[PDB]
Design an enzyme around this catalytic site. Structure first.
Site, PDB file in Angstrom:
ATOM      1  CB  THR A 113      24.263  85.732   8.742  1.00 46.66           C
ATOM      2  OG1 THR A 113      24.444  87.138   8.940  1.00 46.66           O
ATOM      3  CG2 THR A 113      23.896  85.481   7.279  1.00 46.66           C
ATOM      4  CB  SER A 114      20.335  81.569   8.750  1.00 45.07           C
ATOM      5  OG  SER A 114      20.575  81.398  10.134  1.00 45.07           O
TER       6      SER A 114
END
Ligand code: MG
Ligand code: MG
Ligand code: MG
Ligand code: MG
Ligand code: MG
Ligand code: MG
EC number: 3.4.25.1
Lengths: 212, 195, 204, 196, 222, 226, 233, 195, 196
Positions: free
Chosen positions: I1-2
C-alpha cells in the site's frame, strides 16, 4: 508384529505373525518375519523391517564366511554377537530391531539370543517381541514345560501368535511356524489367522466371547 | 493407580484391584482398596490420576445412595453404568477433566444376571464378560480369551483370575503388591480375604 | 492422540433400487489394544438409520442425543422423522459445536416414507452435508472404502445384490485397516422391512 | 548505514555517512565506511563491520598480488573478487558492498553486491539501512554525465535525507572522488547538510 | 528451512500373472494443487525383461531408476553379459535403497518381470530397501484405494461359493493378461474419480517371454 | 474449489465447480457450491464448507426476516454488511470465503468476502484454490459492456480453467444468472465435461458370496395394538 | 541450506510447430522491493538453446557462468564444436539437472527453477523443467512460480496436448506468451512490465527479443469502482 | 539396569545385583547376571543404558585379561578401578558416552584387604565400605549407616544385605526380581546360590 | 500500500494506489483505499483490510450519529474517534490510517494514526509499505500553500515512486480533492504516471 521363540526338549519353536502396517494402513499381510540366516540358524523380525532383513541376510554372509575360514559351524553365541556388535556401532543412528537369533549346535544345544538395536544381547529359554508380545507371553507362560512334545510345542507357539493376532491390532495376517533341530530348522507351514481362529475356537472351545 | 481386572461368570462378577499406591519413588501403601460399593448389588473399581480417582468414585457413590433413598429402590447395574458414563462424558470437555477409568460389577436382581461394564475416562462404555484398564489387558486378555467360559463357577472364575495375576506378577515391571478380590452376586458383595 | 482414530471403526452406506444399505464393523479399541467386538455403530430412530464412526464416547453420546431429539420431534410432530429432515438435524446439532466438536463421522441412511425415495447422506465432524447419490463412507478406512465402493458399486442394485456389494466393500476395506474389523453388521433397508445380517470375517 | 556510489562525466564518486551503532548506542560517530582496496578502486561497506572489514582486507590483498603480477586491475576484476568471497561464503556473511573505481579506458564504474553475493553494474548505486528512504529522491534526481559539482550536490542531498530519516545513519558525510586527476577526499559536517 | 523432499503424486500398480507380469502407472505429475505434466512416463523398461517404477518423490525416483539401469549395464560388463534375473535385480535394488538408509530415496519402488522358471513376478520395496515377492501390489497416492479392490478381485478375499454359506472359499483360478488389464484399468478409473492426484493418462508395460509391450489409455483430466 | 462472478449489461452471473475434497480424497463429485441467500441474491463459497453453508443460511434467514419486517426486497449490501460483520467478529475462525452477487431495487451487484471480514467490489472476481487459473481467463477475455451470453461463457470458461488445471477443483460447472427485472435462473450442472467412462467389468457378485452368521428382522414400526 | 535473496519471478514457455518460445521479465526483486530493473533472466547457449531461470539471482549468475564455461569446455579439442558436436539442449539440461540434484543431495541447493528451451539436431523441440530439488518434468507448456498457476492455464488452451503442437504457429504461440506476460503483470506483485522473449525455431534459428513491454492494458474500468461495499461517492 | 549394591566387610567384598531385565512394558528376563570377573580376585558389577553396560564391562574385562597375560600378574583392585575410571572419564567427553555405572569389588592379595570402589558414568571414583548406584542408595544407605561395622563377618554382611534387599522389595515401585549375590575374598570369587 | 494526504491552499487532497495483495498474489488491482466517513472527511487505509474497513464503518456510524445530534463534526473529531478505536483495541488491530478533512473554519487538515493508536496532526502525511521509499522525495518537494495543480503533481509524482519500488503497491493512483467547492475524484493510470 508378534514374534516368539522358546527352547524345549525337542529343540526350539519359532512362531511369527505376518502383518506389516504404516499407521492404521495394513501395508502387507504376507510378510516373512523369519529370516533363514542359513539352514541351521533362524532370525525373527520386529521393529524396522528393512533393518532386520538387510542385517540378518548380512549376518548369513558373515556366518558363511566364518565356517569357510574355521571349517566348523558357527555357534549361536558367536552368530548373535556378530549382529549385536554391528548394531551397537550404529547405536543412536536410528536403527530399529528386535530379534531372536535361534539355533541348535552340538556344544550349546538349542540356544536363543534376544538381540536388540540398543545393543542388548540376552540368552534365554522364552522370548516374545513386538506390539503383540504381551498377549503371546500370557499363553506361553501358562502352558510352557520343558517336556513338551514337538507336536504340542508347535501348537503352543501357533496358539500364542493367534492370541496376539486377535487382540493386537498391528498383528495378524498369518502364522509361520518353524521347528529348529540340531540337523537344521524345519518349516511347519503358513497358517492364515482368519481360518485358524475359527478352527481353534471350535476344537479348543476358546474365544467364547466371540460369536462364530 | 495401576491394575484393575473384572470377570463376569455364571452367577457373579469378580473384581480384582491392586493394593499398591505409589507416589514417585516410594510405595506409600500396600493394602489400598480401589473400590466403592455404589449399592448393595453394585461395586465399582477405579484407577487413574491421584485424587481424581477417589473424588470421582465417592461422588458417584453419593449420587447412587441419594437415588436409592429417594426412590427406596436399587438402580440396575445398566442404569448406574449409564449414569457413570454420562458423568465422565460430561467431564472430558470440562475445564479440568476427571482422569479416571472404572469397572462396574453388578448383579441385576430383576434379570438374575451378573453384569460387568468397562468405562474409561472419556466416557467410553462397553459391557463385557471380562475387562481391564491400562496395561493390565495387554497381559491378561490372551489368557481370558483362551480359558473363559460363560458358564464358569465363581471358584473357576477365581482360579482363572489367579492365573491372570500370576502372569502380571511375572511380566509386569511394577510391583503392584497383589490384589484385593471382591465377588458381586445375588447375596450382595463380599471380599475374598485370602488371595 | 488424533481423536478420530483412537477407537477405530468404519461405516458405509449405499443406495439400491427401492432400497438402502448401511453397514459397520464391530471393533472398539484403545489404539492397538482390541477392547470390544460387539460395539455396533449403526442406530435407528423410527425408520431413519444413523451410522457413526470416530471417538466412541461421542458415538454413544450422539446416539443418546438423537434418540432424545427424535423422540421429542415425534411427540410434537405426531409422526416419525424423515431422512432428509434428520440429516438437517444432525447438521444443525454438529455445527452448534463448531469450536468444540464431536469427533465423529455420521452417516444417515433411510427411505422417505412418503415419496419412497432412497436417501443417504454423510457429514464431517463439524456438520457439512455430503449428500451423495451412490454411496457414503466414513471411518479410519474411508480411503479403502472409497476405493472399494467406487469400483464395486453400480446403480439400481436389487436388495440381495446390494447386500453382496456393500458387504464386500466393508470386509475388504476393514481387512486393510488395523483399527477396523472384529466382525461386521449389514442392514438391508426396504420401505417396510429391514434385515440385519452379521458377517463372518477374520478376527485379527 | 547510508552509502552510495555515483558515476559522472570525469569518473565516479563514493559517498557515506559515519555512524556505527550497537543497537541504539552509537559506538562510533566518525566511522570511515569508504575503504580502499586499490589506488583508484574503493568500496562502500554495509552490514557486519567485522565481515566487511575482513572481506575488504582479503580483496586488497588479492588486488595487491594481482598488481604485482599482471598490472593494474580493472574495477570489474575487483568486483569479481568481492563477489567470489561474498557468494561462496554467503551462509556465514552479512555484507552489502558497493564497489566503485576509475580506469582510463572504462572511466567511472559502479558495481553493487547485495547480501546474496550477486553482482550488478549500475550508473549509480545506493545501499545500507538508510538507502530505503532515498530510492524515490535518487531516481528522480540522478542524471548521467553530471559534473563533479553536480554529483557532489546529488550525493550530499541524498545522504542528507537518508541521515535525516534513518537512525542507524548519521554523523558526517564522507566522500571520495575518483578521476584521472587523482583521489580527492571530501567531508561535510551536520551544520552544512542538515540545512539543505 | 530447506526441505530436500517433495511429493510428485502419481499411482502405480504391479500384477503378477501365471506367465506374464504388468506394471502400470498414471502419467500425471504434480506439486501441491498444480499439474506439472499430463504425460510424464513413470514406468520404465530397464533391460533384461525387467520393468521398474519408483513412485513418490520424482527426483529420487528418477535417480534410483537411473542407478539401477546403470547397475544392469555394469552387471553385463562384469559377468559376461549374463541376464539379470528378477530376484537378483530385487536384491540389488535393496542395496541401492539401504545404501541411503539415513537419507532415503523417498519412493515406493515396484519391479515386474519373469522369474527363472518363466512365471510372472512382482517385487515391492519400501523406501529403505525392505522387499518381498508379491502377486499383487499397488503403490503411491491411491494405493489405499486400489489394494482392497485387488485383494477382493485378484485373490478372491471374502468371496465364498454360493450355497455353502462361508464353508467353501472361491477357488483361486489364474487370470489372463486381458483379465488383468481390465482390473488395472478399472482400478485407475476408480482411483481417478476419488483421488485428485490421479488422472490424465494410464501407461501399462506388459512383460512376457517375448519382451516388453506398452499400452496407453486416456484418464480424466480434471 | 473454483468460484467466479462476472458483471454484465443488465445483471450479474456467478459460477462454481462441483468438487468437494477431504485432503487429496474427493468426498463429493457433484457438490452444490452456489448458495441462495435470498431469491435474487446468491453466493458461492470456498474454504471450510460447513462454515460457508452455515453462514449463508444464518444471514439468509435474517435477510428473510428483515425483508418481511421492512416490506422490501433484500439488498446485496445488506447481505454483504451482515456477512462481513459476522465473519469479522469471529476473526477468521469461521473459514468462509464468499463471492456474493445479486440484483435488487438499487441495481445489480458483485462482491467478494474473505474470512477475516474484508470485502471487495469488482466487475469480475474469483475465489478458491482454482482462482488463479480462473482469473487468468477473466483477465484475458473480460471487457466492459458484456452481454448475458458473453458473461455466462466467460464465467464457465473461468470455472473450466480451474477444473482442468487445479487439483482442488473438478467435475461440473454450476451457474446462476441474476438479471435485473427478472427471476434469477439457477443452472445446476450447466456443463458436464467429466462423466466417468464405462468400466471394463461388472463387479456384481453371485448371491450367497458373503458369509453370514445371523439374520433377523428389525422392528422399525411402533408398538402395535392388541 | 540458505534462503533466496535477490529473486527472479515466473519463466514461461511453450512448444509450437517448428520450435519453442520462452519468456521472462527483467526484474530482480529484493523481497517486496523491486530492486533491479535490468536483469536478463533468459540466457542463450549457442544458437539452439535458451535457459530461462527464476529464483535466486546470485545462483542464476553462477549457473550462467557454468553454461558459459560449458561452451568453452565443449570447444576444446573439438573440430566439430560449431557443427555435429555442438552443445544440444538435451545435453545442457541433463548437465544442469545433474548439478541441481547433487546440490539438493548435499543439502545446499541452487535456489532456482529452470526451463531449458531449445531445438535439437534433428529439429525436435526440447522443453524441460528442473528446480532446486532436482525434480524434472516435460510438457507442451512449462512455467515457473506464478506462471505455473496463471500462464499454464492460458497456454494449455492453445496446446492442450502433444497433438496440438503441429497445429500451433509461431504467431499464435507468441501471442499467447505475450498475453500471459500481461496477465502476470496484472496479478504477480513481484513482476515487471519490461521483459525479454526468445524464439528458438528450427528454420529461422534463435530470435532473442529484448526490451519488450506489456501493452494494451485494461485499467479504465477502475474509475467506476468506488469503496468496498456501500460507498457511492 | 536397576539395582546394584556393594558391601566391604572384614575379609571380603559382597556384591548384590538385580536379576530383572525390563525393556519397556515387559520383563524379558529374571535371571540376568549384571557382573563380570575382571581377574581372579576382582569382580565388577554394572548398571546403566542398555547395550552400553555389557559392551563396557566386557571391554574392561578384555583389557584386564590382556594385562594379566602380558605381565603374568594380577593388577590390584586399586589399579583396575583407576583404569576403569579413566575409561569412563575419557568416555564422558566422547561423541557418544558410555552410560554405565559400576561397582568394583576386589580382594587385594598383597595387602590382604577387601576393597570396594564405586564409579559412575562421569568417571567419579570413590572407595567405600558400602556403595550403590541409582535409587538403590536412597534407601539402603540409612540401614547400612546404622548396622555396618568394619569387622563384620561375611555371614553378617549377607544378613545386612538381606535387610537392604527386603527394604528395597518393600518400598521400591519396580519389581527387580531379586538379586544375585557374589562374594570376593582371598580364595577368589564365588556365588551365593540361595538368596 | 502507498497512501498520502496533503494539505494545500484551497483545502486537502488524499492520494492512494489501488493494489491489494495476498502474499505475492494481487487479490485486487483496482482497490479504493480512499474511503468516506463523512461528506468532507475522508481517510486513507493501510494494514489489515478487514480491520481498517471495520474501523472506518464504525467511525462513519459515529460521525453520522454525531451529525444528527450536533451538526457537522470537525476533522479533529473524526481523528479522535479513529484514535479511540485504534488505541483501545491496539492488541487486536493492524491499522494505519490517515484522516483528512475540510472545514470552512479550519480549512484543510491531515491527521495520521499509526499502529500504536497515537495521533499526529501534520501538513502532509505518508503511510503504507510504499511510503518508506518516498520520505526523502516528499520532504524535499513538499511546500505549504501549494495550488491544486501543484499538490496533484506532488502526490502523483510521490506515489509514482512509491509504486515503482514497492511491490505491495501499484495499479491506478486514486485521488480525492477536498475543498470549499466540493468533492472531486481523480484517477491516474499507469501509462500516465510511469513515464514521469
Ligand atoms: Mg560385528
Ligand atoms: Mg489384530
Ligand atoms: Mg560473522
Ligand atoms: Mg540520523
Ligand atoms: Mg482439476
Ligand atoms: Mg560414584
Amino acid at each position: 508384529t508378534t514374534t516368539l521363540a522358546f527352547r524345549f526338549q525337542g529343540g526350539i519353536i519359532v512362531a511369527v505373525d505376518s502383518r506389516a502396517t504404516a499407521g492404521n494402513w495394513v501395508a502387507s499381510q504376507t510378510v516373512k518375519k523369519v529370516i533363514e540366516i542359513n539352514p541351521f540358524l533362524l532370525g525373527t523380525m520386529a521393529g524396522g523391517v528393512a533393518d532386520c532383513q538387510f542385517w540378518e541376510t548380512w549376518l548369513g554372509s558373515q556366518c558363511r564366511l566364518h565356517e569357510l575360514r574355521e571349517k566348523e559351524r558357527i555357534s549361536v553365541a558367536a552368530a548373535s554377537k556378530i549382529l549385536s556388535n554391528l548394531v551397537y556401532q550404529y547405536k543412536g543412528a536410528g536403527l530399529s530391531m528386535g530379534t531372536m537369533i535361534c539355533g541348535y549346535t552340538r556344544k550349546e544345544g538349542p540356544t536363543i539370543y534376544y538381540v536388540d538395536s540398543d545393543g542388548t544381547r540376552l540368552k534365554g529359554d522364552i522370548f516374545c517381541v513386538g506390539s503383540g508380545q504381551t498377549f503371546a507371553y500370557g499363553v506361553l507362560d501358562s502352558n510352557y514345560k520343558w517336556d513338551l512334545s514337538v507336536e504340542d510345542a508347535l501348537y503352543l507357539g501357533k496358539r500364542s501368535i493367534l492370541a496376539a493376532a486377535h487382540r493386537d491390532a498391528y498383528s495378524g495376517g498369518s502364522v509361520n511356524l518353524y521347528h529348529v533341530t540340531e540337523d537344521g530348522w524345519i518349516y511347519h507351514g503358513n497358517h492364515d489367522v482368519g481360518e485358524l481362529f475359527w478352527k481353534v475356537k471350535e476344537e479348543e472351545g476358546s474365544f467364547n466371547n466371540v460369536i462364530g | 493407580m495401576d491394575i484393575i481386572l473384572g470377570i463376569r461368570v455364571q452367577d457373579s462378577v469378580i473384581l480384582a484391584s491392586s493394593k499398591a499406591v505409589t507416589r514417585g519413588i516410594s510405595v506409600l501403601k500396600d493394602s489400598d482398596d480401589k473400590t466403592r460399593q455404589l449399592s448393595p448389588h453394585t461395586l465399582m473399581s477405579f484407577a487413574g490420576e491421584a485424587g481424581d480417582t477417589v473424588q470421582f468414585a465417592e461422588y458417584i457413590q453419593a449420587n447412587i445412595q441419594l437415588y436409592s433413598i429417594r426412590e427406596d429402590y436399587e438402580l440396575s447395574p445398566q442404569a448406574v453404568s449409564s449414569f457413570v458414563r454420562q458423568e465422565l462424558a460430561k467431564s472430558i470437555r470440562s475445564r479440568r477433566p476427571y482422569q479416571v477409568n472404572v469397572l462396574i460389577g453388578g448383579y441385576d436382581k430383576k434379570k438374575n444376571k451378573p453384569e460387568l461394564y468397562q468405562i474409561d475416562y472419556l466416557g467410553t462404555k462397553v459391557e463385557l464378560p471380562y475387562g481391564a484398564h491400562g496395561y493390565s489387558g495387554f497381559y491378561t486378555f490372551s489368557l481370558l480369551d483362551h480359558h473363559y467360559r460363560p458358564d464358569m463357577t465363581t471358584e473357576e472364575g477365581l482360579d482363572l483370575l489367579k492365573l491372570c495375576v500370576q502372569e502380571l506378577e511375572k511380566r509386569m515391571p511394577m510391583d503392584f503388591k497383589g490384589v484385593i478380590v471382591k465377588i458381586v452376586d445375588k447375596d450382595g458383595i463380599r471380599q475374598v480375604d485370602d488371595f | 492422540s488424533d481423536p478420530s482414530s483412537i477407537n477405530g471403526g468404519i461405516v458405509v452406506a449405499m443406495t439400491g433400487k427401492d432400497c438402502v444399505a448401511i453397514a459397520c464393523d464391530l471393533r472398539l479399541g484403545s489404539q492397538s489394544l482390541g477392547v470390544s467386538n460387539k460395539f455396533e455403530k449403526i442406530f435407528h430412530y423410527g425408520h431413519v438409520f444413523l451410522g457413526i464412526t470416530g471417538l466412541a464416547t461421542d458415538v454413544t453420546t450422539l446416539n443418546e442425543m438423537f434418540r432424545y431429539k427424535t423422540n421429542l420431534y415425534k411427540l410434537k410432530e405426531e409422526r416419525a422423522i424423515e431422512p432428509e429432515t434428520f440429516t438437517q438435524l444432525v447438521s444443525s446439532s454438529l455445527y452448534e459445536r463448531r469450536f468444540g466438536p464431536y469427533f465423529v463421522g455420521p452417516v444417515v441412511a433411510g427411505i422417505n416414507s412418503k415419496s419412497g425415495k432412497p436417501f443417504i447422506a454423510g457429514f464431517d465432524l463439524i456438520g457439512c452435508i455430503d449428500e451423495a447419490k451412490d454411496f457414503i463412507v466414513s471411518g479410519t478406512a474411508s480411503d479403502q472404502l472409497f476405493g472399494m465402493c467406487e469400483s464395486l458399486y453400480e446403480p439400481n442394485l436389487e436388495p440381495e445384490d446390494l447386500f453382496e456389494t456393500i458387504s464386500q466393500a466393508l470386509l475388504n476395506a476393514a481387512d486393510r485397516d488395523a483399527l477396523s474389523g472384529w466382525g461386521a453388521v449389514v442392514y438391508i433397508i426396504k420401505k417396510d422391512e429391514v434385515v440385519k445380517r452379521y458377517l463372518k470375517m477374520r478376527q485379527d | 548505514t547510508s552509502i552510495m556510489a555515483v558515476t559522472f562525466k570525469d569518473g565516479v564518486i563514493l559517498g557515506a555517512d559515519s555512524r556505527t551503532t550497537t543497537g541504539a548506542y552509537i559506538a562510533n560517530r566518525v566511522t570511515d565506511k569508504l575503504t580502499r582496496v586499490h589506488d583508484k578502486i574503493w568500496c562502500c561497506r554495509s552490514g557486519s563491520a567485522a565481515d566487511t572489514q575482513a572481506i575488504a582486507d582479503i580483496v586488497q590483498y588479492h588486488l595487491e598480488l594481482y598488481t604485482s603480477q599482471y598490472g593494474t586491475p580493472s574495477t570489474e576484476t575487483a568486483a569479481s573478487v568481492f563477489k567470489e568471497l561474498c557468494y561462496e561464503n554467503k551462509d556465514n556473511l552479512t555484507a552489502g558492498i558497493i564497489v566503485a573505481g576509475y580506469d582510463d579506458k572504462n572511466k567511472g564504474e559502479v558495481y553493487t553486491i547485495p547480501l546474496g553475493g550477486s553482482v550488478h553494474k549500475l550508473p549509480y548505486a545506493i545501499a545500507g539501512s538508510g538507502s530505503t528512504f532515498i530510492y524515490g529522491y535518487c531516481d528522480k534526481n540522478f542524471r548521467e554525465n553530471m559534473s563533479k559539482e553536480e554529483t557532489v550536490d546529488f550525493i550530499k542531498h541524498s545522504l542528507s535525507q537518508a541521515i535525516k530519516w534513518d537512525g542507524s545513519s548519521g554523523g558526517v558525510i564522507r566522500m571520495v572522488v575518483l578521476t584521472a586527476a587523482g583521489v580527492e577526499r571530501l567531508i561535510f559536517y551536520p551544520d552544512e547538510y542538515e540545512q539543505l | 528451512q530447506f526441505n530436500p523432499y517433495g511429493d510428485n503424486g502419481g499411482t502405480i500398480l504391479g500384477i503378477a500373472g501365471e506367465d506374464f507380469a504388468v506394471l502400470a502407472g498414471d502419467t500425471r505429475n504434480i506439486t501441491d494443487y498444480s499439474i506439472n505434466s499430463r504425460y510424464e512416463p513413470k514406468v520404465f523398461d530397464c533391460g533384461d525383461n525387467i520393468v521398474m517404477s519408483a513412485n513418490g518423490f520424482a527426483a529420487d525416483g528418477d535417480a534410483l531408476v537411473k542407478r539401477f539401469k546403470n547397475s544392469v549395464k555394469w552387471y553385463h560388463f562384469d559377468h559376461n553379459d549374463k541376464k539379470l534375473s528378477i530376484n537378483s535385480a530385487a536384491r540389488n535394488i535393496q542395496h541401492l535403497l539401504y545404501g541411503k538408509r539415513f537419507f532415503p530415496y523417498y519412493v515406493h519402488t515396484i519391479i515386474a518381470g519373469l522369474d527363472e522358471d518363466g512365471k510372472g513376478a512382482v517385487y515391492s520395496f519400501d523406501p529403505v530397501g525392505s522387499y518381498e515377492r508379491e502377486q499383487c501390489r499397488a503403490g503411491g497416492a491411491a494405493a489405499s484405494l486400489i489394494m482392497p479392490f485387488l485383494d477382493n478381485q485378484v485373490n478372491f478375499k471374502n468371496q465364498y461359493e454360493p450355497g455353502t454359506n462361508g464353508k467353501v472359499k472361491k477357488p483361486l483360478k489364474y487370470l489372463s493378461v486381458e483379465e488383468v488389464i481390465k482390473l488395472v484399468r478399472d482400478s485407475f478409473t476408480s482411483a481417478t474419480e476419488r483421488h485428485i492426484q490421479v488422472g490424465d493418462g494410464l501407461e501399462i508395460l506388459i512383460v512376457t517371454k517375448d519382451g516388453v509391450r506398452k499400452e496407453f489409455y486416456e484418464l480424466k483430466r480434471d | 474449489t473454483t468460484i467466479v462472478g462476472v458483471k454484465f449489461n443488465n445483471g450479474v452471473v456467478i459460477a462454481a465447480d462441483t468438487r468437494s475434497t477431504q485432503g487429496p480424497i474427493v468426498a463429493d463429485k457433484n457438490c452444490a457450491k452456489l448458495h441462495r441467500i435470498s431469491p435474487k441474491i446468491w453466493c458461492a463459497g470456498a474454504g471450510t464448507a460447513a462454515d460457508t453453508e452455515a453462514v449463508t443460511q444464518l444471514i439468509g434467514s435474517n435477510i428473510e426476516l428483515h425483508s418481511l419486517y421492512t416490506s422490501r426486497e433484500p439488498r446485496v449490501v445488506s447481505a454483504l454488511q451482515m456477512l462481513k460483520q459476522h465473519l469479522f467478529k469471529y476473526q477468521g475462525h469461521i473459514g468462509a470465503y464468499l463471492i456474493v452477487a445479486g440484483v435488487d431495487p438499487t441495481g445489480s451487484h458483485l462482491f467478494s468476502i474473505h474470512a477475516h471480514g474484508s470485502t471487495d467490489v469488482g466487475y469480475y472476481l474469483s475465489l478458491g484454490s482454482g482462482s488463479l487459473a480462473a482469473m487468468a481467463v477473466l483477465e484475458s477475455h473480460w471487457k466492459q459492456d458484456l452481454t448475458k451470453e458473453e458473461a455466462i461463457k466467460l464465467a464457465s470458461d473461468a470455472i473450466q480453467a480451474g477444473i482442468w488445471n487445479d487439483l482442488g477443483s473438478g467435475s461440473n460447472v454450476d451457474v446462476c444468472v441474476m438479471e435485473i427485472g427478472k427471476d434469477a435462473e439457477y443452472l445446476r450442472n450447466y456443463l458436464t465435461p467429466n462423466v466417468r467412462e464405462e468400466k471394463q467389468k461388472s463387479y456384481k457378485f453371485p448371491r450367497g458370496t458373503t458369509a453370514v452368521l445371523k439374520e433377523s428382522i428389525v422392528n422399525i414400526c411402533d408398538i402395535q395394538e392388541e | 541450506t540458505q534462503q533466496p535473496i535477490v529473486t527472479g519471478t515466473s519463466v514461461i514457455s511453450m512448444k509450437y510447430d517448428n520450435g519453442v518460445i520462452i519468456a521472462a521479465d527483467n526484474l530482480g526483486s529484493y523481497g517486496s522491493l523491486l530492486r533491479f530493473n535490468g536483469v536478463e533472466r533468459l540466457i542463450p547457449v549457442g544458437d539452439n538453446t535458451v535457459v530461462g531461470i527464476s529464483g535466486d539471482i546470485s545462483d542464476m549468475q553462477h549457473i550462467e557462468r557454468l553454461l558459459k564455461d560449458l561452451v568453452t569446455e565443449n570447444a576444446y579439442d573439438n573440430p566439430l564444436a560449431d557443427a555435429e558436436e555442438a552443445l544440444e539442449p538435451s545435453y545442457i539440461f541433463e548437465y544442469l539437472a545433474t548439478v541441481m540434484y547433487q546440490r539438493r543431495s548435499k543439502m545446499n541447493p541452487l535456489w532456482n527453477a529452470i526451463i531449458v528451451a531449445g531445438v535439437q539436431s534433428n529439429g525436435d523441440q526440447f522443453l524441460r523443467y528442473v528446480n532446486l530439488l532436482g525434480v524434472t518434468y516435460s510438457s507442451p507448456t512449462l512455467a515457473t512460480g506464478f506462471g505455473a498457476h496463471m500462464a499454464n492455464p492460458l497456454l494449455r488452451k492453445v496446446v492442450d496436448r502433444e497433438s496440438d503442437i503441429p497445429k500451433t504457429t509461431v504467431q499464435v504461440a507468441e501471442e499467447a506468451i505475450v498475453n500471459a506476460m500481461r496477465v502476470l503483470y496484472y496479478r504477480d506483485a513481484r513482476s515487471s512490465r519490461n521483459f525479454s522473449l526468445a524464439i528458438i525455431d528450427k528454420n529461422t534459428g534463435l530470435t532473442f527479443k529484448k526490451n519488450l513491454q506489456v501493452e494494451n492494458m485494461k485499467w479504465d474500468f477502475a474509475k467506476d469502482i468506488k469503496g468496498y461495499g456501500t460507498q457511492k461517492i
